[PDB]
Every structure is written in structure tokens, then in C-alpha cells.
Design a protein around this ligand. Sequence first.
Ligand code: BLA
Length: 212
Amino acid sequence: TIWQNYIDALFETFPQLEISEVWAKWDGGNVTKDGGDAKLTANIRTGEHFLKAREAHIVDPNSDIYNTILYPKTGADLPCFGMDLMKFSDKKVIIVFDFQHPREKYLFSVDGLPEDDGKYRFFEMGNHFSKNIFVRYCKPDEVDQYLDTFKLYLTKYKEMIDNNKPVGEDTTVYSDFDTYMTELNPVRGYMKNKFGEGRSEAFVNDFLFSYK
Ligand SMILES: C=CC1=C(C)/C(=C/c2[nH]c(/C=C3N=C(/C=C4\NC(=O)C(C)=C4C=C)C(C)=C\3CCC(=O)O)c(CCC(=O)O)c2C)NC1=O
């Protein structure tokens, strides 16, 4: 996968996050002699200071998408750390990552990180996305140009986690957030095409954004 260095950086920063469940291993897309050409792996990880990290990785002949959110334990008003690393074709990649605060309409920021006040195709800036939302468009062979920046975001996130050491397990903290992410989101339709209506619905509601 072109995302392997991002994935390794994430779990180098947070080595406590171990796989606790494989929620799905699915084949879909066009069926050939070998089976479906689209593959989904959906993992749940757990570990010190986190409620869960949920990691979805979808790969087919043209695309490679890694959608992952880290949900910290509650009690410290911490944001989640979210990423949507999207290769759509051999020419087109979009990288998104951000601190996603669970409180509706609260503008979160971190001093010293890149700032972006632009407006994007889906979602509402400033509402569960921060002043430092990082969105870049590039080609597949260029993605690691932004790796050092992703590593800075991870460094600041680990500082927040380690400085607070949250122990709460109140999943309702994330209900507004998971509801917002569900409504606003191109995922559902793409998954329905490749994997079918029922599998798409369960993926969005019971795996990606299950704290609604
Ligand atoms: C698994 C399948 C999957 C699909 C099909 C998907 C599609 C998808 N996500 C998008 C944007 C986006 N996606 C995000 C962000 C996220 N979205 C999230 O689900 C999470 C967890 C974040 C975390 C940061 C944002 C902010 C945009 C708008 C950026 C843009 O318009 O380029 C767009 C618009 C891109 C554009 O045309 O510019 C598409 C098509 N994302 C996926 O993960």
C-alpha cells in the first residue's frame, strides 16, 4: 500500500494500540476468477488511554483508501485524531487528517501547526474539524512529502494524550460527532456500489460511526 509509512508512523507513536477484533474482511467490486477485485479490512484496536481506534482499509485495482479514527478515553475534553487517506486513481490522491473535537461547533486549534481556513466539498469547517485541518491533493508517488507533517500532528496528539491520561469510558461523549460524520458523508454510497446495501449500512453505522 502507498500508505504504509503513514500507518507505521501512527502505530510507532501509539504502540499500545493492538488489534482486538477483525470486524470485517470482505470481497466486493467486480468478480473475476480470483473473486472480488475490491477488498475491505476493518479492524478495531484498543490500548492504554483510548476507547478504540477503528481502521478501515479498502483496496481495488485503482484505489487505496485508509480511513482511521482514534477515540481517546473521556474525561479530558480531548479531540479524536482522524484521517482519510484516499487514492482514487493512478493520478489522483487526497490526504486529509485532523484533530476532530467531539463538542459540536467548538473551534479547536494547536499553536504552531499549519492553518487552513479553506472550504471543502463535504463537511462543515470548524465543526468537528479544527483550524489546523490538513488537506492536500497530490499524486500517488508524492504522498510521503507530507509524512513529516503527519508525524508532527501525531507528536502533538501524543503530548495531549500523555499529559492528560484520560480514564473515562463514556461513549456518549462521541454521539454528536458520530452522528455528524454519518450524515455528511460520501462513504455510504461508494460502499453500497462495491459491497451491497446491507454491508454498506452496517459498515457505516456499526463500524465507522458506531457511537451514535
Ligand atoms: C472508506 C471509504 C471512503 C470514501 C468512499 C470516501 C470518499 C470521499 N471523501 C471525501 C472528502 C473528505 N473526507 C474528509 C474527512 C474524513 N472523512 C471521514 O470519513 C473521516 C474519518 C475523515 C477524517 C479526517 C474531508 C474533510 C473531506 C473533504 C475534503 C475535500 O473535499 O477534498 C470526498 C470528496 C473528495 C473530492 O472530490 O475532493 C470523497 C469522494 N472517503 C472514505 O473514507
